[PDB]
Amino acid sequence: MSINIRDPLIVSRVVGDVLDPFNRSITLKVTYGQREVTNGLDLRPSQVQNKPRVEIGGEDLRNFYTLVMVDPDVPSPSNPHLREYLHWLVTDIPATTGTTFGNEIVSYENPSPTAGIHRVVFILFRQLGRQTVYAPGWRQNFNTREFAEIYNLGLPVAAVFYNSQRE
């Protein structure tokens, strides 16, 4: 068939629940301690207690990127009425650098799921310009599609997710 049925972002419903279809075009590497996040990797809450290191690609150093980190499975995947929970929001990340050079306008909150296996999703967007993104007023019931529309973030240029569950 011509339709992709195997991409982990499709199989997990990250594309669907959270994201529209998009083309990966910028590298994104998220590392918790020594562990690089790969799609569907299981990480325990102790492993993600502190913010990860985030390195991004890009070829035009003039460009700025926003990183969104959300849990769509809140409070549980079977009753996700708080979808999405915003764990982290970092803006103005210069191309080819990472979140430490960006503005962490919603601080990292470490995941601590207490009901089921939760997807924890990192999404990178190219900004229209520096300083164009503002914070939401709340972390629960966040909506990445709506936020991206409001702040002219277009479609993702990269995304990856891990799975986490209570120990």
d(CA 142, CA 86): 6
Shortest Cβ 141–Mg ion spacing (Å) = 4
Shortest Cβ 71–Mg ion spacing (Å) = 13
Q: Which amino acid is it at 2?
A: S
Residues 67-86 that bind Mg ion (CB under 5 A): 81
The answer to whether residue 152 forms part of the interface with Mg ion (CB under 5 A) is: no
d(CA 40, CA 37): 8
Name the one range near Mg ion by CB under 5 A: 27-35, 40-48, 124-132, 139-147: 139-147
Q: Which of 164, 167, 3 is nearest to 70 (CA)?
A: 164
Shortest Cβ 83–Mg ion spacing (Å) = 6
Residue of 31, 50, 114, 141 interacting with Mg ion (CB under 5 A) = 141
Residues ≥6 apart with Cβ < 8 Å to 81? 75
The answer to whether residue 138 forms part of the interface with Mg ion (CB under 5 A) is: no
Parallel/antiparallel/unpaired status of strands 64-71 and 41-42:
unpaired
65: which strand partners? 93, 126
Is the Cβ of residue 143 or residue 165 nearer to Mg ion in the bound state? 143
Positions touching Mg ion (CB under 5 A) are 81, 141
